[PDB]
Design an enzyme around this catalytic site. Structure first.
Site, PDB file in Angstrom:
ATOM      1  N   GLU A 450      48.457  -3.852  57.463  1.00  0.00           N
ATOM      2  CA  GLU A 450      49.888  -3.367  57.873  1.00  0.00           C
ATOM      3  C   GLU A 450      49.856  -3.151  59.534  1.00  0.00           C
ATOM      4  OE1 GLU A 450      51.660  -0.548  55.337  1.00  0.00           O
ATOM      5  OE2 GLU A 450      52.156  -2.193  53.633  1.00  0.00           O
ATOM      6  N   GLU A 594      44.844   9.231  48.676  1.00  0.00           N
ATOM      7  CA  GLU A 594      45.191   7.986  49.143  1.00  0.00           C
ATOM      8  C   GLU A 594      44.106   7.502  50.281  1.00  0.00           C
ATOM      9  OE1 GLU A 594      48.920   7.515  50.713  1.00  0.00           O
ATOM     10  OE2 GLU A 594      48.683   5.486  51.225  1.00  0.00           O
TER      11      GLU A 594
HETATM   12  O1  LIG Z   1      57.409   3.069  51.945  1.00  0.00           O
HETATM   13  C1  LIG Z   1      57.438   2.562  53.074  1.00  0.00           C
HETATM   14  C2  LIG Z   1      55.850   2.209  53.755  1.00  0.00           C
HETATM   15  O2  LIG Z   1      55.220   3.456  53.694  1.00  0.00           O
HETATM   16  C3  LIG Z   1      54.270   2.921  54.540  1.00  0.00           C
HETATM   17  O3  LIG Z   1      53.321   4.228  54.699  1.00  0.00           O
HETATM   18  C4  LIG Z   1      53.166   1.890  53.641  1.00  0.00           C
HETATM   19  O4  LIG Z   1      52.158   1.664  54.664  1.00  0.00           O
HETATM   20  C5  LIG Z   1      53.925   0.703  53.666  1.00  0.00           C
HETATM   21  O5  LIG Z   1      53.334  -0.353  52.422  1.00  0.00           O
HETATM   22  C6  LIG Z   1      55.454   1.139  52.708  1.00  0.00           C
HETATM   23  O6  LIG Z   1      56.151   0.038  52.510  1.00  0.00           O
HETATM   24  O1  LIG Z   2      50.088   2.103  48.219  1.00  0.00           O
HETATM   25  C1  LIG Z   2      51.111   1.719  48.896  1.00  0.00           C
HETATM   26  C2  LIG Z   2      51.091   0.938  50.212  1.00  0.00           C
HETATM   27  O2  LIG Z   2      50.294   1.895  50.855  1.00  0.00           O
HETATM   28  C3  LIG Z   2      50.025   1.320  52.319  1.00  0.00           C
HETATM   29  O3  LIG Z   2      49.237   2.471  52.801  1.00  0.00           O
HETATM   30  C4  LIG Z   2      49.074   0.035  52.315  1.00  0.00           C
HETATM   31  O4  LIG Z   2      49.012  -0.525  53.574  1.00  0.00           O
HETATM   32  C5  LIG Z   2      49.718  -0.919  51.235  1.00  0.00           C
HETATM   33  O5  LIG Z   2      48.877  -1.938  51.147  1.00  0.00           O
HETATM   34  C6  LIG Z   2      50.054  -0.379  49.808  1.00  0.00           C
HETATM   35  O6  LIG Z   2      50.830  -1.342  49.033  1.00  0.00           O
HETATM   36  O1  LIG Z   3      47.392   4.702  58.892  1.00  0.00           O
HETATM   37  C1  LIG Z   3      48.823   5.044  58.109  1.00  0.00           C
HETATM   38  C2  LIG Z   3      49.773   4.546  58.588  1.00  0.00           C
HETATM   39  O2  LIG Z   3      49.734   3.128  58.352  1.00  0.00           O
HETATM   40  C3  LIG Z   3      50.964   2.409  58.782  1.00  0.00           C
HETATM   41  O3  LIG Z   3      50.802   1.104  58.262  1.00  0.00           O
HETATM   42  C4  LIG Z   3      52.215   3.144  57.931  1.00  0.00           C
HETATM   43  O4  LIG Z   3      53.415   2.226  58.393  1.00  0.00           O
HETATM   44  C5  LIG Z   3      52.355   4.410  58.115  1.00  0.00           C
HETATM   45  O5  LIG Z   3      53.438   4.955  57.596  1.00  0.00           O
HETATM   46  C6  LIG Z   3      50.956   5.197  57.909  1.00  0.00           C
HETATM   47  O6  LIG Z   3      51.093   6.553  58.331  1.00  0.00           O
END
Ligand SMILES: OC[C@H]1O[C@@H](O)[C@H](O)[C@@H](O)[C@@H]1O
Ligand SMILES: OC[C@H]1O[C@@H](O)[C@H](O)[C@@H](O)[C@@H]1O
Ligand SMILES: OC[C@H]1O[C@@H](O)[C@H](O)[C@@H](O)[C@@H]1O
Ligand SMILES: OC[C@H]1O[C@@H](O)[C@H](O)[C@@H](O)[C@@H]1O
Ligand SMILES: OC[C@H]1O[C@@H](O)[C@H](O)[C@@H](O)[C@@H]1O
Ligand SMILES: OC[C@H]1O[C@@H](O)[C@H](O)[C@@H](O)[C@@H]1O
Ligand SMILES: OC[C@H]1O[C@@H](O)[C@H](O)[C@@H](O)[C@@H]1O
Ligand SMILES: OC[C@H]1O[C@@H](O)[C@H](O)[C@@H](O)[C@@H]1O
Lengths: 659, 659
Positions: A450, A594
């Protein structure tokens, strides 16, 4: 502290304590370090606007088991008890506290999220006296600050045989979206004439309580139970009357019949199990992973777990690809009826996915990045994943097809699998763009990594689109239907690119950036688009050092472990197995956060990935493209003498692996 | 840590920390051990049904000063700062935090409940760099769980000279009784063209924030201010627009003019002061007592403090005889305009007292045991004090008459004092019962010793009725009115009984029970019904060991201290002075809890009693029955070389006492 069935804590330390959960897939109860209290209670399927994200969320609910115990007017506290211990029995999801009160009595309390009654909880309290004492017992119903417009009721349900005193509260979620009802009773051994008189107090706006006194002579045991029902307008149109009806039902079923049914259902869940010889810590850790997935799911429903299950409000209780790709596969192999509930969740929400597709200018079904009650998009708007992380649609398709491969249920495929596979394939056919070279691109996404936002031709995303189109075409053939020929033409020409070193390129702008989590490596497992063992290894070599130690979720190292097991590299497989969860543990019960060093347990997604490393990696078990479960070459960690996996596939096969 | 003007804490310990309060009599802000945060904010005059007691309460309000500071993207936390100190300057009610961030910068922040603007708060932040750095500054408006139906707004107020960015929230108390508005802005030195751009984020249901970045070269100072206004529909019909109007007003007044007016009003309050030579700890402790009473009151209002002032939700923010008998007398002597506001509170609520009298079958005005907005009874119904602790009516009468004795304001006596004294005397004339011997009884009360419930002829209660009837009769004479002759006939024959040992009997069922607090001893001081020094001493001897160490409030030992000072017994007076508050202290600022070893500061009632022990006991100052302040014989503690009390009475007299 290496009991293979029990997690124990001596003298819970409130300054460094992460509670454990008991759950039945509907209610989760998270433990408190304080005696005879619970920290948090979560009800599945109840969402409203609340705190994080400005979107729907799970709501902290009534801490319905909270009790105050006094001995000769002296209040039981952390500070005046000794030999205080807590224990989670993973065999039956019993959380037990035990302590000594001065020279007077030994207390034990065990509570349960009843496995057969989704909306019913029970706690059993045992008091064993060393001297004459009088106990005062209070059960408190405190309306949490998450709820409003509460009403606090109390009444006696009587006949010639019983007096069932009901302590009931009804309240509303923040916007009024959901009415919650809770109804508690005390159950006594001694019967109507001899049972203690129950008083009711309403002294606060947000708390009422029921209480009794009981004289206990020295050297006697006195036991009683607290039964509670917790239900909302998301579950039943009249939660107030249904909660009282349920508690009356449970009181007249009685403790023995309730616990017997509870035990029978937990016994059935544990007919699918993982046994490790030569590593007592790994055996307990893997049992905890199975215990949490079993607690956070429910056969014969349309429930799907959040990334944190019922352990709290992690990710607002939303459903993500965390189910389809992370928690679903180990459950499909061990308990296909659990996997059935997980994909039923998506089937029920197919119309909301069709509505999302139309709003965003596509065909078919576009599953949301985050799902809750309706199946519409629930992602916070400041997270670009909600608008742009599209692979979730292919993840749902892959799980639907895998459900059919493992079960061979052609009736399910016709009624539910094909609706999903056809609509999600129509989405991808509308989502791709053909370029001048006749290749198909998927432009402007957020990657499974992401940290790569608004980039083109993400490896994992493009792979899920390929699999979705292929599996939809195969599904049509099973049902005697001609799939649109365009699905295969597109699947065969979707771009998956290599860099100059022959390594799978994560996306069109990728050179050597750090990545949040597994992406290109997911093409090897789970997608199995990359089968060439040299290509698998080249991709592991390039990407395995790209995931930083900090702020990276437990959605990587379990895949590395599995892929190294499949490459028959025991040392690397075991390195990555340990790294996947041991740096993420919280005391005193080794719950999983996590990220490495995190403090937000319990990350059920992480457990799901590790269970795949154990079952599909060390155990070599695999979903055969032609149907059923097959076994491929694997290795065990050096120190594992035997790995036994039971209840696999619809034939409930046992697999034993040794060196 | 014996600065006579400052309370300091090195390295606040969150495991053992009781915050200090800054307040202006309208807003109280209670400190957090965390940098750039506040624990709790309380607004006077805003009550709704909430938690304790099922009755009206103060409501936790917006923690409007909460800020997040980051240096080059790194978040400032307790764990990554050093040399962290907090300090309360009692001279001007400034709470200051200071710390070092690694090798980058020194931070100081000072906040104020502006003394001249009841609804306005300001924090000033100073950053002094040791290296080049970029700061990110965020101010958060989190709606507390006590409020509902919030709206989160942001806008720019502009003209050719300014851009005032307003961060505003509007929300409701639990039942919808009160609309709260808060509006914050950043104030910059550098002016419109050069000031940082302000971003607004709305990412959560219950939180929005405004933020900016600022590059600061090494060896520079960068300062800015946060100004907030906090107001409710209890204070103004349109709090939303009034909060924004106030913050715009304060921004265009500017930091210098705001702090100058703040300083001028605090300087005026400290023109009445207590100076002790030879005991630096006593000097600081007595300054803290004066500081809290000054912070928790406001001249030229109808505000009255709760037992905990604006330090939190102690006793739901209700007004008790804690004002009239405990906090009122020292304020009457030092700052008669503060005492005027305290009795104005009751004058404004005389009609509600008349309504209570009629509902409970009496004549005149029956003041409630606990008062809030309306002046109706607010005591929780499970506390029998609300129905039966009647002496509060006489306590209000005594304070009204004392206000006239000290000020000689005959216009006030005609307009306000006499309405109170006449109505409260009519209550007592209807409350007494004449017996066969022609004596007057007051039957079935809760005593000032509240452990004696539903008893007859309580010493303190009967004494307050005597004084109320006598003072009402004297008041009539000042105004040329004939008081009903029955008032004197009743006052002269109300029962005050002695036991066989010649000791004043606390009530008709009293022999030797433990007592919660001073009762019969209050007939010596404050009532001065008992003047015979042998009777005073006999009563002290019998009752002084009747108050247990545990669960007894700070409403006893200060009276013992004062009475022993009046008996010229220096050792006993000083013993009881220390016992009155030193066993009740909480770290790190020596705030005062209600009971010995308690953890519920700040008990302003306790401070009021101790200040009487110092001013009326050690200083010998007394309200003369004929008018004005007189001095009676007193002693100092052995170790006090000099006691100087300034600003006493309408002539603003200084009294100096030595050995
Ligand atoms: O809930 C909002 C977003 O939070 C981020 O920390 C996560 O990486 C995303 O997967 C999630 O969609
Ligand atoms: O666990 C919820 C979400 O968390 C984010 O940190 C991850 O990038 C996503 O792959 C995941 O779906
Ligand atoms: O590495 C953790 C970070 O990943 C990003 O992809 C998410 O958007 C953030 O919400 C999260 O704090
Ligand atoms: O109340 C529950 C009980 O009811 C009785 O009628 C049955 O005989 C028991 O088997 C059962 O446990
Ligand atoms: O904004 C407040 C300022 O306004 C100016 O017009 C005055 O000259 C200053 O004395 C004052 O402090
Ligand atoms: O401070 C509020 C109340 O607290 C109780 O502990 C005391 O008995 C009362 O005299 C007092 O008014
Ligand atoms: O607020 C209810 C009651 O609380 C008790 O703790 C106090 O002693 C009473 O004075 C008060 O009326
Ligand atoms: O001693 C403290 C106790 O005093 C009683 O008068 C009050 O009613 C109780 O609320 C309180 O806990």
């Amino acid at each position: 502290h290496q009991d293979p069935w029990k997690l124990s804590a001596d003298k819970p330390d409130s300054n460094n304590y992460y509670g454990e959960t008991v759950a039945n897939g509907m209610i989760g109860i998270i433990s408190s370090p304080e005696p005879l209290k619970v920290k948090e209670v979560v009800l599945a399927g109840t969402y409203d606007i609340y705190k994080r994200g400005r979107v729907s969320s799970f709501i902290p609910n009534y801490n319905l088991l909270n009790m105050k115990l006094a001995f000769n007017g002296e209040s039981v506290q952390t500070y005046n008890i000794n030999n205080y211990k807590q224990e989670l029995d993973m065999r039956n999801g019993a959380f037990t506290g035990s302590f000594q009160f001065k020279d007077l009595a030994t207390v034990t309390y065990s509570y349960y999220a009843l496995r057969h009654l989704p909306h019913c909880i029970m706690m059993v309290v045992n008091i064993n006296t060393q001297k004459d004492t009088e106990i005062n017992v209070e059960n408190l119903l405190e309306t949490p600050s998450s709820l409003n417009n509460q009403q606090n009721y109390f009444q006696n349900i009587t006949n010639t045989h019983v007096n069932i005193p009901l302590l009931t509260s009804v309240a509303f979620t923040p916007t009024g979206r959901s009415k919650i009802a809770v109804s508690n009773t005390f159950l006594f051994d001694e019967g109507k004439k001899l049972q203690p008189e129950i008083l009711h107090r309403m002294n606060d706006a947000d708390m009422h309580a029921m209480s009794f006194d009981k004289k206990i002579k020295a050297g006697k045991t006195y036991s009683f139970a607290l039964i509670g029902s917790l239900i909302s307008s998301d579950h039943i149109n009249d939660p107030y009357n249904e909660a009282e009806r349920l508690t009356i039902y449970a009181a007249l079923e009685g403790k023995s019949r309730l616990l017997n049914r509870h035990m029978q259902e937990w016994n059935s869940l544990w007919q699918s199990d993982i046994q490790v010889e030569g590593d007592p810590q790994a055996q307990q850790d893997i049992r905890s992973m199975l215990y949490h997935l079993y607690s956070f799911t429910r056969k014969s429903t349309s429930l799907s777990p959040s990334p944190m299950g019922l352990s709290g409000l992690g990710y607002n209780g939303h459903v993500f690809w965390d189910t389809e790709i992370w928690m679903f596969p180990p459950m499909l192999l061990l308990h296909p009826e659990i996997a059935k509930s997980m994909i039923e969740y998506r089937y029920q929400r197919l119309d909301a996915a069709r509505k999302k597709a139309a709003i965003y200018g596509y065909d078919g079904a576009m599953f949301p990045w985050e799902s809750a009650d309706s199946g519409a998009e629930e992602t916070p708007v400041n997270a670009l994943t909600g608008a742009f992380e599209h692979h979730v649609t292919g993840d749902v398709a892959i799980a639907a097809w895998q459900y059919y491969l493992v079960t061979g249920d052609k009736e399910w495929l016709k009624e539910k699998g094909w609706p999903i596979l056809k609509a999600t394939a129509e989405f991808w056919a509308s989502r791709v763009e053909k370029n001048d070279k006749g290749e198909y691109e998927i432009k402007n996404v957020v990657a499974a990594d992401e940290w790569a936002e608004n980039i083109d031709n993400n490896a994992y995303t493009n792979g899920t689109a390929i699999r979705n189109l292929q599996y939809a075409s195969k599904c049509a053939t099973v049902l005697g239907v001609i799939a649109p020929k365009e699905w295969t033409l597109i699947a065969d020409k979707i771009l998956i690119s290599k860099m100059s070193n022959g390594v799978t390129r994560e996306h069109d702008s990728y050179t050597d950036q750090n990545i949040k989590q597994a992406d290109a490596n997911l093409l090897a497992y789970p997608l199995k688009l990359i089968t060439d063992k040299e290509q698998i290894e080249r991709d592991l070599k390039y990407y395995q050092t790209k995931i930083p130690q900090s702020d990276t979720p437990a959605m990587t190292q379990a895949i590395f472990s599995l892929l190294y097991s499949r490459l028959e590299d025991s040392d690397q497989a075991y390195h990555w197995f340990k790294d996947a969860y041991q740096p993420n543990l919280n005391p005193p019960f080794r719950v999983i956060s996590e990220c490495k060093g995190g403090t937000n347990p319990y990350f059920s997604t992480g457990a799901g990935g590790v269970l795949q490393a154990v079952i599909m990696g060390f155990g070599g078990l695999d979903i055969d493209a032609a149907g059923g479960i097959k076994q491929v070459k694997s290795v065990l960690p050096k120190n594992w003498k035997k790995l036994t996996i039971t209840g696999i596939g619809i034939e409930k096969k046992t697999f034993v692996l040794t060196h």
